[model samples]
Target: GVIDTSAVESAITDGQGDMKAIGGYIVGALVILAVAGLIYSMLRKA
Candidate 1:
């Protein structure tokens, strides 16, 4: 795969890599939590 990461690198630097390359993981975690919450609510209705 061809990849261009300049923009992302800049963003990381902008955030001072405060995330230290963990932003995607953090996002993934949040998305999982959100979906789990939705599923839990649905199950609760049953």
Candidate 2:
């Protein structure tokens, strides 16, 4: 008898998308903070 395992492997890989979602949020927040800091520095110089 032949066993089919393709379905099980596909299901396991589906959850990997969460890692990318979390990483994107972290990168976005850091960029926002960097821009805010630059703006504040310019204001203080004036």
Candidate 3:
């Protein structure tokens, strides 16, 4: 239980915009990786 003003300021200032902007790329890359692994598994087994 702490009143962390610095934490709030950092979140509002840097983390907010960075997360919003980079979130799409992060999800997109994860999707591509998932699909790639799926395809690779099927190809290797079949």
Q: Which structure among the candidates has the greatest lDDT?
A: 2
TM-score of 3: 0.37
Clashing pairs in 1: none
Q: Write the per-residue lDDT of candidate 1 for residues 1-46, one digit (tens) a residue.
A: 3367677776667865456587867777777667756766776777
Per-prediction CA RMSD (Å): 8.5, 5.9, 5.2
- TM-score for each predicted model, relative to the true structure: 0.35, 0.41, 0.37
Error of 1 at 14 (Å): 13
Per-residue lDDT of candidate 2, residues 2-46 (tens digit)? 356776776687757767977988888887777767766777777
Any runs in candidate 3 off by more than 4 Å, and if so which? 1-18, 43-46
Model 3 collision count = 0
Q: Which residue runs does candidate 1 get wrong by more than 4 Å?
A: 1-20, 43-46
- Residue-level lDDT of model 3, residues 1-46, one tens digit each, is 5579677877767664547677888888877677766766766776
Candidate structures ordered by lDDT, highest first: 2, 3, 1
Candidate no. 2 TM-score: 0.41
- Where is model 2 poorest over a 10-residue stretch in terms of lDDT? 1-10
lDDT-wise, the better of 2 and 3 is 2
